[PDB]
Amino acid sequence: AFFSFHTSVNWSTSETQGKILFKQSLGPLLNPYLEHLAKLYVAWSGSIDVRFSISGSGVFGGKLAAIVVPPGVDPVQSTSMLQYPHVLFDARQVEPVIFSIPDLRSTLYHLMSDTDTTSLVIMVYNDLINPYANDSNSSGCIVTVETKPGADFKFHLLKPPGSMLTH
Amino acid sequence: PEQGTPVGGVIAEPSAQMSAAADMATGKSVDSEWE
Amino acid sequence: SITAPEQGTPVGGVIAEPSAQMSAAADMATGKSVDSEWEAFFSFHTSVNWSTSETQGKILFKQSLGPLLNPYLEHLAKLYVAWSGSIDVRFSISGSGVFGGKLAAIVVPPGVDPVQSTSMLQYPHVLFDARQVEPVIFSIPDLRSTLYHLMSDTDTTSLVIMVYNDLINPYANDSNSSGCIVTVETKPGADFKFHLLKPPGSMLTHGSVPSDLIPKSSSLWIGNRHWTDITDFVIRPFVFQANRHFDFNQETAGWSTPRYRPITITISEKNGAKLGIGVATDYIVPGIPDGWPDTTIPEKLTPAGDYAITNKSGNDITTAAGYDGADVIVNNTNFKGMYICGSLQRAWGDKKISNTAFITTATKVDNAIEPSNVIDMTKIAVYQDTHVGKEVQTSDDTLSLLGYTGIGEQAIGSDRDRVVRISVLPETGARGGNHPIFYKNSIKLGYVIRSIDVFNSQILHTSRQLSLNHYLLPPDSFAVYRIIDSNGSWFDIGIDSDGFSFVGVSSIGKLEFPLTASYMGIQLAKIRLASNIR
Amino acid sequence: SITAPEQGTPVGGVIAEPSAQMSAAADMATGKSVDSEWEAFFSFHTSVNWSTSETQGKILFKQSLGPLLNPYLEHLAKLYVAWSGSIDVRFSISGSGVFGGKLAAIVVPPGVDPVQSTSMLQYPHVLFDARQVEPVIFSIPDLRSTLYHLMSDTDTTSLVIMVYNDLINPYANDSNSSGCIVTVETKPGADFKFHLLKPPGSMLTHGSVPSDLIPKSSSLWIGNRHWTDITDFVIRPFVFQANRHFDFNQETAGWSTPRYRPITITISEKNGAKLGIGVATDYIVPGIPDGWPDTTIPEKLTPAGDYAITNKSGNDITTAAGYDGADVIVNNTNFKGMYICGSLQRAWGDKKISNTAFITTATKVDNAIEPSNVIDMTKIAVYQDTHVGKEVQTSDDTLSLLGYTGIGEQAIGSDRDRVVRISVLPETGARGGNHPIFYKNSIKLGYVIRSIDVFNSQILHTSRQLSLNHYLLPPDSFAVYRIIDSNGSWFDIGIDSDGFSFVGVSSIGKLEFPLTASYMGIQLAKIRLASNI
Amino acid sequence: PEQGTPVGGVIAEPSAQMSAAADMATGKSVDSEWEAFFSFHTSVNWSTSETQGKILFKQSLGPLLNPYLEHLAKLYVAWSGSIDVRFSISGSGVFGGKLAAIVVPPGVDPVQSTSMLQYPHVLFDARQVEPVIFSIPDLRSTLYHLMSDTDTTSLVIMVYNDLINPYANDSNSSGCIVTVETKPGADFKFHLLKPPGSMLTHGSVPSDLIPKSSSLWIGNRHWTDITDFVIRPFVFQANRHFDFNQETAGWSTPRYRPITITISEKNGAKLGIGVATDYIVPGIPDGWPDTTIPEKLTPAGDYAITNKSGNDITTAAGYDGADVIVNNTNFKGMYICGSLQRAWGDKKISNTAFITTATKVDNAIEPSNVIDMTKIAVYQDTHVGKEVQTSDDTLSLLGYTGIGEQAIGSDRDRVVRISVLPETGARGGNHPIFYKNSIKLGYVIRSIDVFNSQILHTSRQLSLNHYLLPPDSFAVYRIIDSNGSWFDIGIDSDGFSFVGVSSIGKLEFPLTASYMGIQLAKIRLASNIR
Ligand SMILES: [K+]
Ligand SMILES: [K+]
Ligand SMILES: [K+]
DSSP states (O other), rough: OOEEEEEEEEESSSTTTOOEEEEEESSSSSHHHHHGGGGGGEEEOOEEEEEEEEEEOSOOEEEEEEEEEEESOOOOOSSSGGGOOOOOOOOTTOOOOOEEEEOOOOOSSTTTTOSSSOOEEEEEEEOOSSOOTTTTTTOOOOEEEEEEETOOEEEEOOOOOTTEEOO | OSSSSOOSSSSSOOOSSHHHHHHHHSSSOOOOOOO | OEEEEEOOOOOOSOOOOOSSSSHHHHHHOOOOOSGGGGGOOOEEEEEEEEEOOOOOTTTEEESSTTTSSSSSHHGGGGGEEEEEEEEEEEEEOOOSOOBBBBBEEEEETTTTOOOOOOGSSSOEEEEEEEEEEEEEEEHHHHHSSSEEEESSOOOOOOOOEESOOOOOOOHHHHHHHOOOEEEEEEOOOOOOEEEEEOOSOOOSOOBBBOOSSSSSSSGGOSSSSSSSOOOOEEEOOEOOOOOOOTTTTTTSSOOSSOOOOOEEEOOOOOOOOOOEEEEEEOOSTSEEEEEEEOOOSSBBBOSOOOOBBSSSSBOOOHHHHHHHHOOOOOOOOOTTBBOOOOOOOOOOOOOOOOOOOBBBBBBBBBBBBOOOBBTTTOOHHHHHOOOOSOOOOOEEEEOOOOEEOOOOOOOOOOOOOTTTBBOOOOOOOOTTTTTTEEEEEEEEEEESSSEEEEEEESBBBHHHHHHHHOOOOOOTTTEEEEEEEESSSEEEEEEESSEEESSSSSSSOOOOOSSSEEEEEEEEEEEOOEEEEE | OOTTOOOOOOEEEETOOOOHHHHHHHHHHOOOOOSSSGGGGGGGEEEEEESSSOOOOOEEEEESSSSGGSSSHHHHGEEEEEEEEOOEEEEEEEEOOSSOOOOEEEEEEEOOOOOGGGGGGEEEEEEETTTSSSSSEEEEEESSSSEEETTOOOOOEEEEOOOOOOOOOSSSSSOOOOOOOEEEEEEEEETTTEEEEEEETTOOOOBBOOOOSOSSGGGGOOOSSSSSSEEEEESSSSSEOOOOOOTSSSSSSSOOOOOOBBBBBBBOOOSSSSSOOOOOSSOOOSSSOOOOOOOBBBOBBOOOEEEEEEEHSSSSOOSSSGGOOOOOOOOOOSOOOOOEOOOOOSSSSSOOOOOOEEEEEEEEESBEEEEEEEEEEEOEEEOOOOOOOOOOOOOOBBBEEEEETTTOOOOOOOOOOTBBBBBOOOOOBBTTTTTEEEEEEEEEEESSOEEEEEEEBBBHHHHHHHOOBBBOOTTEEEEEEEOOOOSSOOEEEOOOOOOOOSSSOOOOOOSSSOOOOEEEEEESSSOOOOOOO | OSSSOOOOSSOOOOHHHHHHHHHHHOOOOSSSSGGSOEEEEEEEEEEEOOOOOOEEEEEEGGGGGHHHHHGGGGOOOOOOOOOEEEEOOOOSSSEEEEEEEEEOOOTBBBBBSSSGGSSSSEEEEOOSSSSSEEEEOOOOOSSBTTOOOOOOOHHHHHEEEEOOTTTOOOBBBEEEEEEEEEEEOOTTTEEEEETTOOSSSSOOOOSSSSOGGGGGOBBBSSSBBBEEEEOOEEOOTTTTOTTTTBBBBSSSOOOOOOOEOOOOOOOOSEEOOOEEEOOOTTTTTTSSSOOOOSSSSSSOOOOEEEEESSOOOOOOTTTTTTTEEEEOOOSSSEEEEEOOEEEEOOOSSSSSSSEBBOOOSSSSBBBBBSSSSOEEEEEOOOOOOOOOOOOEEOEEEEEEESSSOOBBTSSSTTOSSSOOOOOOOOSOEHHHHEEEEEEESSSSSSEEEEEEHHHBBHHHHHHHHBBBBOOTTTEEEEEEOOEEEEEEEEEETSSOEEEEEOOOOOOOOEEOOOOOOOOOOTSOOOOEEE
8 A cells, every 4th residue: 555665776977878777677575565475475466566766956957767678678778778668757856756567477477586577677868967076976866766566466376384486 | 645646658557357367377266365 | 272181082991881880899899988088087196104103294295286197198198298287186095993193185386395394284284084984086276377288397286195193003002113004096187188289200399307217127227337237326425427427408528428339449559569549439529439438547557567466464365265355455456447348459460369458548658657537539548469569550449348457446436536527527415415326336357256336427228318308407406216125115316407316315225126216206406305214 | 363462272270270369368468559559658769968058049959850750660661661640749858956048949840941040939939948847748740732751851840949048057167068968759649650661672762861871889980991990080171082982872983892801913023023013803993903092102202122210300210209209200211101011922933921012003104103193004003022033923912901101291181182083083172161071090100100190081881871772862961960979069960962071160179989970860051060069 | 647748839730631631642541561461481492303201391480471570570579479371382284293281389399201291281282273371370378479489380381292294304303483471360469569779688589690691601710701611520619609608718809800919029030929919818819810830830931832742833733733732831830911010110111920829939839729828929020130129010811821731620639729619519410510711822822721610790690699599409591592402501509500411512602591490409400402
């Protein structure tokens, strides 16, 4: 019923356009409560909802993009990846933004080891700017990622406790 | 009402018939089985 | 223009035609009431003893779903690429009535591998007492992420029987132990169907299950270092071999094929030279002959003389009472660690009869040989007296391994520094808490009428199948084979992706050798390979 | 006996027959939009910069409607010859809060060319302030006197981004290098559709669009005269080259392919010559080898000796690295501007190792050689000792070019009377206030470890594409691109129908050299090309 | 709901009646027209000599059966469904012959045995009025495919009954012309639009390793065009030879450009040991040739040839008309270069160089198949006196002074390797090949052969693209000639190329290479060289 803090990543002025600050694949590790209940199961399926924001300043410009790439693909640090639907987010933007990561699977369930799932990447759309520190170049913009389970999310296949996973 | 603007910048379409396919491959039948 | 697979004008038999009265007559003569009879009865699978010595949480039975459970499906499976569906696994127990003790049943899902622990009972389990009269069936459902299974697939739903409560005899003392054996049978199940009939002469693109690595009888077991029959297993902390040792990738760090046949070479000693370097004539790797032995000499020495041994104090041994009566041997012989190799030894102008050889990988400096355990085109030593006098001869020679001159030494393959490789020596240690094993042969000696032990990483049937056939096994699992001797003492060997074999106990002991080997299934390597030694 | 494209005897797939339940299974497994997912979102196309230098009324962007405004349409355009309909646009500015200014977007109709004036804002336009975060969306309609377009058509409706209010920053009144990247994203309109499948391999009569002549990265830029990497630009009142220079008609006034390879020839001399005349063995024009250098020696000279250098009227040899700090060189060599080429002098009975070549085009009067402004089969000079006696020797040579001899000279291409042609040398001056450029790279000298500059009329990719592919451009127009360095400096190059690249500035200055190029569109050659340097 | 505020600051009004006017000027009628017709894919000559059981056509299901799907496949990473395939035989009515089509399942790899005909197969005659259409169904365990997937349903077509021409003679090699056309089935669908520039994480498809024309095939050892192939039992090479892992046991990039070095010697030393200034492996100059000399040499003088009998070759009659050739020059088996030499104060024109991997002892070099920074030998004058001379030298390889040697890459000892020598024998009934080339010689206007483990396009593509291939598989490449003789090459995961036939023979050299998918390495590669 709520979004939970998962991680936070930094975005300085050094990171040029097209760089990838984040890549994490779909799974129950995107939320602590699922990482807890994953221990009681061997399979899962379904989507995760995400909310992300930037604790930026007003003097900071730049812009940042979020791209749910499908299974199989590995991304590349190029602005050609922005030729694909993507959630723009400006550093000057205060209110967070929400979107889903669907479970696009050739199978009927996943296993906890599966890492060929749908994946999210945070990619630099426009370089971050600050007219002040042209001497230190150590500006901020913490970029938080929060997660909530999708309604289509559910675990499958209780494992016996103590039993090991083959994969 | 929780904070955040939802945005459909995706080709996502989470299908509900795939969750039933998973409940068919696995005889799920209950959300908390230990009960 | 076009004709379907069942199309053509029929004329029939020209003198007669098919009759139904005669086909009916064969059903009268027989008991043919339905086809595919194996779908109508339970077929024997195995049987386990459940004794009072076995505490709770022990696993007695463990099989994953598949067509290798029933033999009648294992046969038809050769015609199909895929399968799907459930198997029914009947259980029978005949208790004494005065006994007590309940026995659990758990159909664990796919993706897991069980453990002997009561934590497995923190999970849905059916129970049945020693006083159970009728059999119980326990259909194993096919839970699968795919739409069909292949035959190489092994991550399938499994069923385990495990001790829920210990078996109890009120009359039996704490010392004497009794038991009741539980028999297991299988039937194809109603939703079972094979899929995708394959055309014959078709490579299957992933192979099949590693079910044919160890033969089902010990009469067919011979080592990958020497051709003789196995006689016992040997547990050591590290196991290693290169020559005929093959992995599941059909690749080898050796230089020979999995077959023993003579060694044809040519050697061009110039002057009076009882030793020289031979060159390959038959080979898979350039430079090295196929069948060349994978062991060096201990020391630098000049082969020039005769045999010699002593009983630790200069007392030479010339009789069996001295050899067997000795505790250790010095072996002052000048051609110690080599192989006798009969040596036809033909050439043009060498009318003298041939003389045996002595071979190893070693260097050569004008009279001698030094131990070099890295085989090359120049590490092919021979000492056979090819009657040379001050002229190049270039004799052709064929050699057949017979014996080993290294009297008094330890078993062959026990020292890596003496074992030969090209660049990389395959080697393992204890995976999980499961110890590796050598397979033990014996090889003839020089003039003593005894023999010396010989260690082997594989059985040659295991090497042969892994050179030709393609198998799937991740680097974390084992292909398990349950060994059963004549008395019933059993243990499980597990073969590696690397090709090495393991065992789940520190010592096997002695055991009847007319023994067998049955494929139980794939098993993760952490889990201790089960055993019952007695 | 007649069969149509969808006609035949259907037998099926013998072992099974296509199931619809599996195709419906795959739709739910993957989600689904209606058969063209690219029609549903905005895709990154380009980004343009807006500094404080750009005054009010300046135009930062002009690109005409077409399928090049979206990558997915540029892909499927290759399967068609016609199109029609609108494109949706979303644009934004990655500005700061401290930045002011304001920017405007104007869909001008067909026919009109815009002007850098605020009078263009007397027309409906989308205002966008630098302080504005949420993007803004609007359509570019297809307003056409025809019923369909062709891929070459550039008289379509067009968009321009125009400075409405100058950008402001109270901080940097010393550097004046502020930012505000301005991105443009595109989506197809619902009225968009392609027409008229072309057969694959078939060419278009009206040509394609010149959008691939320069690569998108400077790592791939090499010269049409020497194979080294471009390093900077040069502006001159006249720009000329013939050898590997190709116009838009796939025509070159020179003699060589757009490649760099060894040069095979066959000398034949006698009595002790060292200065023979070769003959071609690989060519496109009869007589001249493919890849022969397009430059002639300064004057008449009798190659006999070795290198000789000296400073300003001083008779002081530059034996050391005091070559530098001299600023003038006499270059007293008897070989004084030839090209150095490693040779493989193969002959029958020579029995001696080969020697370097020292080639050029010139007229062999005697041992001497006179500068030939024009090339011919009777001009192909080579100065090397092939070890000749009295009898003829007909060696095979197979040269490969390594360096240059004209130490202390201007860059190869400055002087014109030394640059070689066949008959007519292509040349271009200023064309509407825009200045032509060379592409400058380097070539190694023979004696001093330093290198000398070399001028080029094109990038070799521009020559390979114009040698092979068929493009449209009216003579009164450019195929305009925008060059952007790692900093925020940029300038638009314009490639004319003759193959020459122009520039609007008089001096480009130094630039962080990892550069990129993007196709903006077709412009007239009269209006000056935009810049910020 | 997508981001952005729409604003009608326009006089635009996109009219919908103009899109219908365009559908009237052009008979559009369908958004994806390629689904409505069959498109040419290939053609095979079915001859009177090809016997029963020989496969004419074999292709697994996928987008590569149709160009329009091959074009749209670049925008996606998944597909699913059937593709139709049409056949038109086009022979005379005096001909009598019959083919058989086999749709084999997803999970087997067929062979050229008649055991494929122990399985449901449809027969169809040479003398057909109307062409025949086969739909290849997408049988699968998954719910969709990826573009890297190759275990799919296939269609095999072989000769059930040999083709007959009653008017046949030794001078009449007539037959039928079987054209294959494809159309995507009604159930074909692409899925999973990809981001551009993104690479599949497990690998792409080896569809581009051999170019489609021999006009631009060049070797990975010498820059000259291939001429024909060579079959040998053991093929091996390190430099410029890349596997399917973007890895290399060599030291130079998959290209050809000059070799810059510096040589510092003194006391009139014509020998030297150069040091790199453009490397990828620390020490070696990134382009140094991978072959040594046969023997110890003291390079002093000039060329020298005989013919086993102390004669001397000074004309193009003895060289060609010699029993054998004996190279008695003190610089033999090394590489001729252009060698522009620069040094401050060297008022002397550059002399050509002679380079090879070898040690040095004060006047003489000895061969060493190993290479490091201590083996980079040169032989140039350099015009050095008593003191050191840094001599910035740049080399361009043009020839080879090993007149009498057999071929470069034939002797494993002469071939250079850092530590490891990539090497393969046969795998199945399939033999490994070299790609043969030619390099020029020093004193003679003739040439010598050169062996290459790869075409250079095969090397650079593997240098910078991660493809997918199991170890027990090939990437097959059908290679036809101007006449009609053809054979399949199979590239191994190690980067080596194999062939099924034992001898190739003569070939009209305007060749073209296609791609015929994946094939298990334990299966004979096809051949119709005759
Ligand atoms: K003999
Ligand atoms: K010569
Ligand atoms: K020099």
